[PDB]
Amino acid sequence: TQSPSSLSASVGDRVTITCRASSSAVAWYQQKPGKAPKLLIYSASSLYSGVPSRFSGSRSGTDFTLTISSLQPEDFATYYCQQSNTELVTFGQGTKVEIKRTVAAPSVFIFPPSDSQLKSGTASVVCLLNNFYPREAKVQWKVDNALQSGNSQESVTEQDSKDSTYSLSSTLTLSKADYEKHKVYACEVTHQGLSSPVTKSFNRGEC
Amino acid sequence: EISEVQLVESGGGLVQPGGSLRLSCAASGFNIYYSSIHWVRQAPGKGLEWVAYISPYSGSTSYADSVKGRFTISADTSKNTAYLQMNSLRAEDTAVYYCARYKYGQGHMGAFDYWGQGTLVTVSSASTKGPSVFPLAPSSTAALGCLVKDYFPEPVTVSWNSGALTSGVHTFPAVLQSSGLYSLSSVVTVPSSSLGTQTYICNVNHKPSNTKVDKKVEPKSC
Amino acid sequence: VVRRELSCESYPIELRCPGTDVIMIESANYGRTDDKICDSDPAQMENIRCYLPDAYKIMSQRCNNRTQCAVVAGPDVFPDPCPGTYKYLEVQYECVPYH
Secondary structure: OOOOOOEEEOOOOOOOOOOOOOOOOEEEEEOOOOOOOEEEOOOOOEEOOOOOOEEEEEOOOEEEEEEEEEOHHHHHEEEEEEOOOOOEEEEEOOOOEOOOOOOOOOEEEEOOOHHHHHHHEEEEEEEEEEEEEEOOOEEEEEEEEEEEEOOOEEEEEEOOOOOOOOEEEEEEEEEEEOOOOOEEEEEOOOOHHHHHHHEEEEOOOOO | OOOOEEEEEEEEEEEEOOOOOEEEEEEEOOOOOOOOEEEEEEEEOOOEEEEEEEEOOOOOOEEOOOOEEEEEEEEHHOOOOEEEEEEOOOOHHEEEEEEEEEEEOOOOOOOOOOOOOOOOEEEEEOEEEEEEEEOOOOOOOOEEEEEEEEEEOOOOOOEEEEHHHOEEEEEEOOOEEOOOOEEEEEEEEEOOOOOOOOOOOOEEOOOOOEEEEEOOOOOOOO | EEEEEEEEOEEEEEEEOOOOOEEEEEEEEEOOOOOOOOOOHHHHOOOEEEEHHHHHHHHHHHHHHOOOEHHHOOOHHHHHHHHHOOOOEEEEEEEEEOO
């Protein structure tokens, strides 16, 4: 089980996906986040009721393919193939079709822990990356200029409906005691849209 | 009273590692006997994984090598309901489970044209906990937010100003922490001239634990 | 002219003649004679020699001397000629005038 493959495309484009999972029994499905999958094509080439005509399937040897003739706004989702392997069913790894847009730099913000949490005994420092493209981004934490690894976690949003961008939050977590041992906390952000890495920092004790 | 083909699932919930749970796929509008029932799961952010099938016509069964020996699929045609008994559950089994049908007589040769709404199974040893909320204070377009940390279980929703703030809002997906509790952040971008002029309150709802928190975020003075 | 109808197991068949005509069944089989008709699981489509000639009689009784006929191809009418093989109902018939 793998995470979906990524394909950056623009409205009007033509996408030809091939199925790797092992019959003539190939079926293709579309899924958008938070909803159950929907059948598009069954038996390699038959268009399911209610599906737009732009969707098609073909077979050339062991090569089964799903082809969208013209990408429309609601075609941007994840697509899965299915193959009947004897007494076994095998879905493909998935293709998430994302939109192409103009490179945009993130706005970077850093958040010190709340005096409230410090009492709990833990310190979370947060770095916010806002409205960038492409997704490829590097967030490096430095504590008194020591590069950090393994004590942070990140989550990234899905593409925004209007901006077609992405946002990411990275959280650095320390015990309170370790936090009270250092001074400079910084998040360095590398992204194609910044001509050089942008570093946001604060000094523990000056707010 | 008018008939319709529908697959309604039940049985999902929280389990502890090594325990057991029974999922049920009740069929309406068609007879399971003339269909093959499959269970397909999807872990958060992952692809689809077929688990098991049953064809009540001949009652043959197949199981994924990942679930063979721990999971048993069955069907009761008089109740038009298929079942998936999941014993000895392990953390890697955590995922939304969807039951699907291959209706014979239509040409589909394996296609799934109707799926269930899906039920979530969370296999983990940790226990239910209300979340702790902390401010992300703006430092002198500015940004501010709230940190929802240490909560169980998934999922939980968050709003701002009781749902009044949606432009420029980013509620980040939750990240499983090494403690086995979840944590998420919700941020908003606002004007730098709006220093206390606009009320900034975050509204946090935790339905599994019946926990509701509202936290007002303001700049910090020295 | 001979007309042909086919309906997979559990699905209904409707034989129909225009205006005031009489259905006269000429052929009727509930079972399996082809592996690429009425999709099912591969193993449930194995037997190719599944025939039920009684279907001719049963169909004639339920349809002959009528304008339209309808039979669901299943355990409601025919029995199980090849248990474990998804069956299908193939009925040939001609529309003739009344007495």
